[PDB]
Design a protein around this ligand. Structure first.
Ligand SMILES: OC[C@H]1O[C@H](O)[C@@H](O)[C@@H](O)[C@@H]1O
Ligand SMILES: OC[C@H]1O[C@H](O)[C@@H](O)[C@@H](O)[C@@H]1O
Lengths: 354, 353
C-alpha cells in the first residue's frame, strides 16, 4: 500500500484534552468515530480518564452510579491477593483472567471538528457521557453510520451487566434519540452498513464468547436499525496470519462496484493490531468474495508503536472523496492519527492476494 | 403447594429410545419443548447420543461435519494432562474450564405424542437434526411458543462458532421453515412470549458472558419474531440463594390477570437445578413485579436426583388447562417427567414471598 501519513500526526493526543472530572487525568483520546456534518469532519473521540490516587498502594475504579448520576470510586489494594493488576486497563479476579471486575479508566465521547481534515478543534462539552445502568464503566468506541439525513452513533456500553452495543440517532449532533442496546452483551465492533440492501439493513458485529468460539466478525440483518436478527458468521481468525488472535469491524463498509469493502482490524495473539480488508458481495453481504493476506495499514511510525501490549493501529472510521479515503485511526490506545490511501489500491491488493 | 408428580414418572427414559447412530448409546431424552397439536400433547425431546469406546482409557467427542454431511469422532485420553473430564457433559481444556472444546454427546430433537398427557409414543424419525454449520455439536433444548396457527420452535445451536439460538416455524410439525439464528452467541434459554404486547413481540433470553456479567435472564423486543432488539437486563442471580449460580427461562410465559408468570430455572454454583417463578407487568414485561424466594419444584424424587447429571429439574414447557398447569420437565439430564401444579398457588407463593 501507498499510504500517505499526515504531516501533523498525531493529530490529537491526551495533552490536547482537559479532564472533565476533578482529580482525574486524560489518558486517551482515541478510536474516533468519523462523520461529515455541515462542511466539517467530525471525530467522535473516546476520551478515557483515570483518577489519580495519592496513595500508591490503592488503585481506583471509576464507576458511574446511575441512581445518583455521579461517580463513586471504588478502591482496591494492589496487595489484595484476590486480584491481578497486571493489565493496567483492568482490575481482574485471579480466578477470571479472561475477564474483568472493573476498568481503571472511564470513557465518554467528545467531538472534535476540522475544516481541512488535518487540524481539529474540540467541542466545548462532552457529546455522550454515561447516562444509564448499561454504561456505568463507560461509553467507548463510537462508530458513525450516516443514512440520508440520519447519523447512527453506536458504541460499547460497559457495566456490571456486560459489554453491550447501544445506539443513538441524530440529524444535527444536538438533538439525540436513544434507541437502546441494539446488540446484547457480549459484543462490540458494530458497524452499520450505510444503505438498505435488497430490502434489509445490515450490521457487522463481533460476539465475544465464553465457552466456545473465537473472536470472529459476524453480521446481522435488520428491518429497521433497531432490532437485529439472522445472525451469521462472516470472518474468522486465521492461525499464523496477522489476524490469528481476533478480528473486528473497523470502518463503515464502503460501497464499491466490486462489493462492500470492509476495512477491519486484526490482531495476533501478541496484540499487534493492523488493518486488513475484505470484500463482500454487493447484493448479499453475507458472502465473502476476497480477503487480504497482508495488511493494508500497520504500526510502523513511532506514534503507532509502544502501546502497552503491542503496536496498534485501530481505524474506526473514514471519509471517502472519490478514489481517496481519509482514514482516521487510534494509535497506541492513546491518540488519533490520519492517513490517505486509494480505494483502487485496496481493491487491487484484494485481487492479487486471493 | 400441590405438586402432583405423575405415577408414571419418569415418562420417557433412554431405555425407551433407540440410538440412530451406530456405535452410540442414548444417554438422555430430556428437556422437551411442549405443544398441543391436533388434540395431542407433543414433547420435542432432546435426545442425546454418546459414542461408545470399548477402551476405558479413551473417550470420544461426536461432531457433525456440516460440509461433508457426516459424523466425525474426536478421541481423547482421559489421562491427557491438557484436558479435564470432570464435568460429564463436556471435554474442557485445563486452561479454559469456564468453557468447552467438545461435548460428550450430540443431541437432536425427536417428537413424542400423548392423548392422555401421561403415556407417550415417539414419532419414528427425528424432527430436527443438525443441518448447518451452527449446529455441528448438536441441537438442544427446543422451546415452543404457539401464536395463532404458527408454532415457534427455537433451540440451542452449538458449534465451533458458539452457542447461538435458532428458530424454526411450522403450522403442522411436518413443513418447516428455517428462520436463522435469532439470537447471536453466546445465548440460550430463549422463551418467546405467546402474544404481541402493546404493539411488540418479546422474548426472554440468557446472554452468557465471558468478561463481565452474570448468567442472568434478559429480555428483548421484536417487530416480527425474526429480529430482536432493545435488550434489557431482567432477572439476576442471588448470592446465597437457590439461584446463586445462574438463572434461565424455563416455560413459555403464561398470561394471568396479575401479569406474565415466568417459570424459570435456577441453579447454585454446585449445579443443583430447581424451578422458581417471577411475575412481570402485563403491559410492559421489562418490569419485574415479584419473584419467589423459595423454589416451586426441586429435584427430590430418585429420577430427579440420580442420572447422567444429577439433582436437576429443568422444565422447558407447560400446558395450561384453566388453573391447572401440566408441566413437563427434564430430570437429571436423563429423562422426562410430568407434574400438575396450580397457577393460583404459584401466584399466592409469589404474593407471600
Ligand atoms: O470494553 C471493555 C474493554 O475491552 C478491551 O480491554 C479494550 O477494548 C478496552 O479499551 C475496553 O475498555
Ligand atoms: O449447550 C452446550 C452444553 O451447555 C450446558 O453444558 C448444558 O446445557 C449441556 O447440556 C449442553 O450440551
Amino acid at each position: 500500500m501507498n499510504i500517505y501519513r499526515y504531516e501533523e500526526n498525531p493529530l490529537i493526543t491526551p495533552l490536547d484534552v482537559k479532564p472533565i472530572h476533578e482529580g482525574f487525568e486524560v489518558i486517551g483520546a482515541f478510536n474516533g468515530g468519523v462523520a461529515e456534518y455541515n462542511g466539517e469532519v467530525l471525530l467522535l473521540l473516546r476520551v478515557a480518564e483515570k483518577p489519580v490516587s495519592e496513595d500508591p498502594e490503592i488503585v481506583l475504579a471509576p464507576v458511574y452510579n446511575a441512581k445518583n448520576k455521579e461517580l463513586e470510586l471504588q478502591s482496591f489494594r494492589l496487595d489484595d491477593e484476590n486480584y491481578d493488576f497486571e493489565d493496567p486497563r483492568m482490575i481482574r479476579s485471579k480466578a477470571k483472567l479472561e475477564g474483568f471486575s472493573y476498568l481503571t479508566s472511564l470513557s465518554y465521547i467528545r467531538i472534535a471538528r476540522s475544516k481541512d481534515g488535518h487540524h481539529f478543534t474540540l467541542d466545548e462539552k462532552p457529546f455522550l457521557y454515561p447516562f444509564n445502568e448499561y454504561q456505568t464503566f463507560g461509553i467507548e468506541d463510537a462508530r458513525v453510520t450516516q443514512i440520508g439525513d440520519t447519523y447512527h452513533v453506536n458504541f460499547s456500553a460497559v457495566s456490571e451487566f456486560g459489554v453491550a452495543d447501544a445506539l443513538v440517532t441524530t440529524k444535527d449532533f444536538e438533538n439525540l434519540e436513544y434507541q437502546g442496546n441494539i446488540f446484547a452483551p457480549e459484543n462490540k465492533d458494530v458497524l452499520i452498513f450505510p444503505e438498505k440492501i435488497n430490502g434489509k439493513y445490515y450490521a457487522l458485529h463481533r460476539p465475544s464468547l465464553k465457552s466456545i468460539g473465537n473472536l470472529d466478525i459476524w453480521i446481522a440483518s435488520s428491518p429497521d436499525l433497531r432490532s437485529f436478527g439472522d445472525h451469521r458468521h462472516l470472518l474468522g481468525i486465521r492461525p499464523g496470519e496477522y489476524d490469528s488472535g481476533r478480528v473486528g469491524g473497523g470502518c463503515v463498509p464502503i460501497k464499491t462496484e466490486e462489493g462492500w469493502l470492509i476495512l477491519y482490524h486484526g490482531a495476533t495473539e501478541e496484540n499487534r493490531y493492523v488493518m486488513g480488508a475484505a470484500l463482500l458481495d454487493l447484493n448479499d453481504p453475507t458472502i465473502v468474495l476476497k480477503r487480504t493476506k497482508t495488511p493494508i495499514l500497520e504500526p510502523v511510525a513511532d506514534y503507532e508503536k509502544n502501546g502497552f501490549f503491542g503496536d496498534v493501529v485501530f481505524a474506526c472510521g473514514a471519509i471517502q472523496e472519490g478514489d481517496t479515503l481519509h482514514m482516521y485511526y487510534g494509535v497506541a490506545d492513546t491518540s488519533m492519527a490520519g492517513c490517505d490511501m486509494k480505494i483502487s489500491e485496496i481493491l487491487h491488493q484484494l485481487e492479487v492476494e486471493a
